[PDB]
């Protein structure tokens, strides 16, 4: 498939934003950072796979053409919003449309790819999550999907 | 179970605003309650 040049230009602008060298190549860490910053959702397993593919060359830097190929390969995979809704419904044991904030925090902290608790507090503050009050999964999914 | 800790704490809450309805925080029942609250928090707290 061929990507629209407007999207390609936007991707290049995003790359240049964090490209502290300005050469069109940057470290794989900021590669994943801007990959997430694009709004797409790559698994950390997929992130490590992409990192090792780049490291096979040994450069450690993401050249813009290979970056565009990575963009296309990410465009190949596209999960649906209903899948996220069902995933959140799975954790909605009550099924009342609301989920507990503390238990969701524990789910985030101690399952699978564990992330920092400061990121959990970031979710709490940005999504105006009450510390103990029940939070609707659906509103969170909607304002998450708004992008 | 760690899952039931939230239920216990939520019930303790429900009782405490029940007390708020009668404005009996001065009575001291919460002081009888803290053993249960401490047990629930201990269960909820990570023990690694």
């Amino acid at each position: 498939d061929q990507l629209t040049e407007e999207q390609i230009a936007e991707f290049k602008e995003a790359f240049s934003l964090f490209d502290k060298d300005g050469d069109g190549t940057i470290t794989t860490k900021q590669l994943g950072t801007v990959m997430r910053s694009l709004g797409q959702n790559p698994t950390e397993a997929e992130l490590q796979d992409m990192i090792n593919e780049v490291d096979a060359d040994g450069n450690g830097t993401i050249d813009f053409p290979q970056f565009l190929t990575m963009m296309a390969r990410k465009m190949k995979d596209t999960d649906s919003e209903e899948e996220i809704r069902e995933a959140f419904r799975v954790f909605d044991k009550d099924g009342n449309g609301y989920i507990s904030a503390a238990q969701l925090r524990h789910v985030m902290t101690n399952l699978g790819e564990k992330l920092t608790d400061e990121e959990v507090d970031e979710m709490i503050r940005e999504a105006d999550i009450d510390g103990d009050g029940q939070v609707n999964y659906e509103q969170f999914v909607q304002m998450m999907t708004a992008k | 179970s760690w899952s039931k800790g939230m239920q216990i704490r939520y019930n303790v809450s429900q009782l405490e605003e029940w007390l708020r309805d009668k404005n009996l925080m001065n009575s001291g029942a919460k002081e009888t309650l803290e053993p249960l609250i401490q047990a629930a928090q201990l269960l909820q707290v990570k023990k690694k």
């Binding site: 009550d94 009342n96 609301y98 507990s100 029940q134 | 039931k4 239920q7 216990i8 939520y10 019930n11 429900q14």
Partner: peptide, 28 residues
């Protein structure tokens, strides 16, 4: 008398019942 009334009540109402946010619940 109050303890006698409440004795079978608590176990079912408090722990056995699953709160949703001979059968007794928190609201009971």
């Amino acid at each position: 008398v109050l303890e006698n009334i409440l004795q079978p009540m608590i176990v079912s109402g408090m722990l056995e019942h699953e709160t949703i946010q001979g059968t007794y619940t928190l609201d009971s």
